[PDB]
């Protein structure tokens, strides 16, 4: 492993701690969510993101954040706002934006300087 990979694993672990049921742990299938494939063409989940970190496919935090936002956006797109899935996705979306904001990334940069 590498430093960028460890920081992204950290951010991932912190986000996944907010999903203790594991709603977003693994890909949604049509078996569990009828019509999911019809509505969601760009699927994402925390397991996939973990595999992508391990293969070093994220070249920046911006790239990692985009997949994270995509996962949350898919949950809010397929599910209606009165479901546990939508509500949690909105919450964790906010937490991730705060955790990985410019201001936060700047303080971390200081500690590498």
Ligand X SMILES: Cc1cc(=O)n(C)c2cc(N3C(=O)CC[C@H](NS(=O)(=O)CC(C)C)[C@H]3c3ccc(Cl)cc3)ccc12
Q: Would the CA dihedral through 29, 7, 70, 72 be positive or negative?
A: positive
Is 110 a binding residue for ligand X by CB under 6 A? The answer is no
Candidate residues 15, 54, 61, 68; the one interacting with its own copies per rule CB under 8 A = 61
Among residues 56, 57, 92, 55, the alpha carbon closest in space to that of 72 is found at 92
What x-and-dash track marks residues 28-67 binding ligand X by CB under 6 A? Answer: xx-xxx----------------------------------
Q: What is the nearest approach in angstroms of ligand X to the Cβ of residue 54?
A: 18
Residue 106's alpha-carbon distances to 23, 65, 109, 113, in angstroms, are 31, 16, 5, 11
Is 24 a binding residue for ligand X by CB under 6 A? The answer is yes
What x-and-dash track marks residues 74-113 binding its own copies by CB under 8 A? Answer: ------------------------------xx--xxxxxx
Among residues 71, 62, 70, the alpha carbon closest in space to that of 8 is found at 62
Is 32 a binding residue for its own copies by CB under 8 A? The answer is no
- Answer with the entry of ligand X, its own copies, none that 49 interacts with (C-beta below 5 to 8 A by kind): none
């Amino acid at each position: 492993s590498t430093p960028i990979q460890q920081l992204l694993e950290h951010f991932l672990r912190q986000l996944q701690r907010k999903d203790p049921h594991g709603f977003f742990a693994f890909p949604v299938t049509d078996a569990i969510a009828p019509g999911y494939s019809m509505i969601i063409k760009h699927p994402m989940d925390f397991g996939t993101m973990k595999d992508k970190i391990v293969a070093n496919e994220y070249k920046s935090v911006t790239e990692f954040k985009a997949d994270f936002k995509l996962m949350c956006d898919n949950a809010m797109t397929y599910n209606r706002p009165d479901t546990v899935y939508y509500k949690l996705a909105k919450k964790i979306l906010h937490a991730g934006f705060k955790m990985m904001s410019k201001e936060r990334l700047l303080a971390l940069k200081r500690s590498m300087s």
